[PDB]
Scaffold this active site. Structure first.
Site, PDB file in Angstrom:
ATOM      1  N   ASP A  21       3.529   4.600   0.718  1.00 20.62           N
ATOM      2  CA  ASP A  21       2.808   5.181   1.854  1.00 20.62           C
ATOM      3  C   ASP A  21       3.747   6.008   2.711  1.00 20.62           C
ATOM      4  O   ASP A  21       3.421   7.135   3.100  1.00 20.62           O
ATOM      5  CB  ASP A  21       2.162   4.087   2.709  1.00 20.62           C
ATOM      6  N   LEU A 236      -4.940   5.435   2.736  1.00 27.17           N
ATOM      7  CA  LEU A 236      -3.610   5.914   3.061  1.00 27.17           C
ATOM      8  C   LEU A 236      -3.321   5.499   4.475  1.00 27.17           C
ATOM      9  O   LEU A 236      -4.112   5.774   5.380  1.00 27.17           O
ATOM     10  CB  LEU A 236      -3.525   7.436   2.958  1.00 27.17           C
ATOM     11  N   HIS A 237      -2.204   4.829   4.693  1.00 25.05           N
ATOM     12  CA  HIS A 237      -1.925   4.336   6.026  1.00 25.05           C
ATOM     13  C   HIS A 237      -0.998   5.272   6.786  1.00 25.05           C
ATOM     14  O   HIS A 237      -1.435   6.014   7.678  1.00 25.05           O
ATOM     15  CB  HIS A 237      -1.342   2.916   5.972  1.00 25.05           C
ATOM     16  N   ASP A 238       0.287   5.234   6.434  1.00 24.47           N
ATOM     17  CA  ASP A 238       1.314   5.930   7.205  1.00 24.47           C
ATOM     18  C   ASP A 238       1.020   7.428   7.418  1.00 24.47           C
ATOM     19  O   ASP A 238       1.254   7.949   8.512  1.00 24.47           O
ATOM     20  CB  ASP A 238       2.677   5.723   6.556  1.00 24.47           C
TER      21      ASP A 238
END
Ligand SMILES: [Ca+2]
Ligand SMILES: [Ca+2]
Ligand SMILES: [Ca+2]
Ligand SMILES: [Ca+2]
Lengths: 308, 308, 308, 308
Positions: A21, A236-238
């Protein structure tokens, strides 16, 4: 193929604990002439600090950015130990700086005429150390745009998101700092799902960096979709931090009071988000709650084209 | 016009802190020949115990049920003080029993051949006292069906629902008791909204009790729809316990581990619900997460017709 | 050989978890015509509740007091489990009452014209249940004279004394109750040491009960003098409660604010005693800090002579 | 009149929050050719950081040590605010370094061939920051010799000593660090009392520095003897750290496990000292419990003569 920042770009420091990520986040940040990445520093959460630093070097090597100042940060959380229990990136082409990570942060912040935005995407250990050690530089920090937290429902414990859980004390210090914060927590990142057709758009972008991102997404499709979460595509995090820097209008945001729990029996690492204004406390963060998912994908595709 | 329970009815004890949600709950419980209410006991949360007891007597008077054993319970939470800061019910036609509330509970539980279901809809103070004081009767308690808690987002503090917040210690004791629990928290009650057309259906039911309920709902439409919550209609909380007793198939339920936080800086009174099986801990409650709202309204209409 | 209380005796209820310290306490209490023991109830700490109840029956049998109302209390702490890991008393000559322990307490307290002193010498579980369940009887409780706590240095954990540690929640409820308290903690009991010559005085008292006490003390001399504590003789804990009832001038006492810690990482079960008036909080207990040791021994010898 | 350290002196860094106890500590440290003070850094507890830094400069000016590297440290505790609510020292003759305090610590520690002893006498904020930020230097830290804590009885709250209470998080990090610690807490400092005749001995030492110390002690005799503590003479706290460095045989010491409480309702800032080996935990500190008071006075007199 280095992207040259505009003179008017937003100066940022990327503080990260890559796995994958974070890798996509760094790739997006370094694709944009609207951002000026002054340094990369590494944190550690569920991998040893030697690994996250190596991974940062591998990502920077992929991007042909051996010029980027990079330094490994804290080897463990402030008051706790690390919690240790995919596709391949190129081997590193260069060595990191030996300079202390928060000394490097202070150097870049002090030297930047424009106040700098700190962008952490792992545990907040280095950010907290910087905040506590360099009070005279707070006025030279624009904002802290962090991936972490959840306004009620955790992904590591029932109450806590991973980055905050790893170092609740550091997170507490960040939220108490008086520096502006944008919190990109699970509330928004859970919505930031990548579909099959989105991956194929990315894979069609005619450069090696997009190919790498598409491979990472393929991997996420298989291993980041535990059915219990009920995801349609892989979240998707970051990268949501970078998307907020580039196109904040993609997001639903609200100014909230946020407290980090460091004392509870069951709730350590929780971000307590007063979305419904029950506490009377002054807001200390812009909390992101939703996003235009298609717009987010469009932004990623546009960004990765910069490497053509 | 007393409703006679079937010999095969579910025996229950109603433990409540009425204001108005509880009133509707009692009205629904006493409308059904499928339930056998053995006693009513009162708890206190944000009104003095004299008031909640008086209100219980007023509700029982409305229903012409002066035969119902009723007793006032604890005057305050176990380890904390009360948090003290509408349409009218008839004046009471009778006096309560002077018997101690948990002594009354024990008497009814001991005397019932069939294990009894406890149905609290206020702070869990009396239930905890009963659990701790009468261990020999646990095998004669079928289940505790409670209104309280929230799987992440509180309505009193950001982390805590009101009933649990008032007496976290009592709630902790309930969830640790080993007695089966059904938790009807804000996750489900937020969905249990009554629309204008639903109120008009209820008002059309040709008896005084339905008229009373419709008046209560009119009041809720005005004062229980703070726009920040984003309700379309007014939620009904406590009656969800009775609906689960009568028609559990209306509900989406999951067996979860639930812990009550009693130690945190920001999170006291939180119910920590391990919906995503992150802790490895054995489930101790059936937690309700959603309901068939129209089915819930249909059940209420059918119930109130019993008073025709 | 039952000792008949004076009409003007202090009414008391003895709530205890005997092993051997409690046994000496009961023996002293039942030796005095200045005390009127209305009932004995049992608590449990580091032995199963069946054992502490049996032991109470054995002690009462030793004393030829099968007339004494006795009932077993709570089977475990309020919010925690029991912590389970000598010379012989006679086999029981009688059965206990089947009556609930706090119901028995309430009966005796309600029936006593004179307000009653509760005298716990084990975990405070039953006392807390009584306090929370019978608020209307608080005015009929003179005082709670308890063995427990330590003004800084524990004997079970570094911060906590055993009785409090077993059930911190119960203890918290006691200290918050508003009922007068005398706290006989480790500060005083550590000084209440029995020397060889003291045991021989007791053994010379010409009755079987004194012989039993001397045997218990012999045992304490061997097994209750871990050299790390630096005791010269064996301390007596629980009997200090009875000594304070009979001859309070033996003791150095101070009115203090006392709080029970139920939330800390390392300090659960600590009694936080504001001996130096640092908090500004109103005193809620008479805390005992020292005693006239020789006077204490003299009192014991005088007491046991009542069985001649 | 600067005292030249022996080549074989113990290298130390003095981290302090002077008022007056710290002043005496610095005076003693800089009197000894057996110690090599590499730097002075300042912390803040109950005075603003500008004041403690100024006071350090005034002390160094008194001693004609404008050569000493000195830097102001953290402006507040890690996760809390400062707690803000005598005879005169000379005005400062020089300015402090502008260098960051923990950067200065790292520089001196890195440059010292011999591992360095850190000697804090205020809140542990800077020490914790150093520990967390410079893990690679832990092997170059001999020991941390700190004034703080109490093995049961606090002087600020009932459970906590002032230095620890000001910054419990920092203290927690120190005790978890794995660096050897000597803890000079209230247990020993309460015994380190200066009598009238001791002051007159000091005043007779024929130099200005001794005159200053005697004046400070005169002041302590009046204002540091609140009768509630039961002191005969005025205790000296911080100087006990230097006395332990110079003559450890003056002290009764024991290796103990020590934990710092950061989570409790009533006990935040407590040092939980397992003096009686109840926890089974490995010792992490040398804790001082008593001292040879006359020997301590003799050492002070001998030390101050170095300024003749
Ligand atoms: Ca990350
Ligand atoms: Ca209610
Ligand atoms: Ca006992
Ligand atoms: Ca100091």
């Amino acid at each position: 193929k280095a992207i040259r920042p505009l003179a008017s770009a937003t100066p940022i420091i990327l503080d990260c604990d890559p796995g994958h990520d974070d890798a996509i986040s760094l790739i997006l940040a370094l694709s944009s002439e609207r951002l000026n990445p002054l340094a990369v520093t590494t944190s550690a959460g569920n991998q040893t600090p030697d690994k996250t630093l190596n991974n940062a070097l591998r990502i920077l090597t992929l991007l042909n950015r051996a010029d980027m100042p990079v330094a490994g940060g804290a080897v463990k959380p402030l008051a706790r130990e690390l919690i240790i229990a995919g596709p391949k990136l190129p081997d590193p082409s260069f060595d990191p700086l030996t300079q202390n990570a928060i000394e490097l942060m202070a150097e870049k912040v002090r030297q930047s005429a424009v106040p700098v935005t700190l962008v952490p995407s792992g545990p907040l250990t280095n950010i907290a150390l910087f905040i506590a050690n360099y009070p005279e530089l707070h006025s030279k920090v624009e904002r802290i745009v962090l991936m972490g937290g959840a306004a009620g429902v955790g992904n590591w414990t029932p109450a806590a998101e991973f980055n905050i859980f790893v170092d609740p004390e550091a997170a507490d210090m960040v939220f108490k700092s008086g520096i502006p914060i944008t919190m990109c927590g699970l509330d928004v990142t859970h919505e930031a799902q990548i579909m099959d057709e989105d991956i194929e758009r990315i894979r069609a972008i005619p450069n090696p960096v997009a190919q790498c991102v598409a491979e990472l997404l393929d991997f996420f499709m298989i291993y980041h979709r535990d059915p219990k979460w009920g995801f349609t595509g892989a979240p998707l995090h970051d990268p949501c931090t970078i998307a907020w820097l580039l196109k904040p209008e993609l997001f639903t945001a609200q100014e909230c009071w946020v407290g980090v729990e460091t004392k509870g029996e069951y709730t350590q690492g929780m971000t307590v988000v007063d979305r419904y204004q029950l506490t009377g406390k002054t807001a200390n963060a812009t909390v992101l709650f939703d996003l235009d998912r298609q717009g987010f994908v469009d932004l990623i595709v546009d960004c990765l084209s910069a490497y053509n």
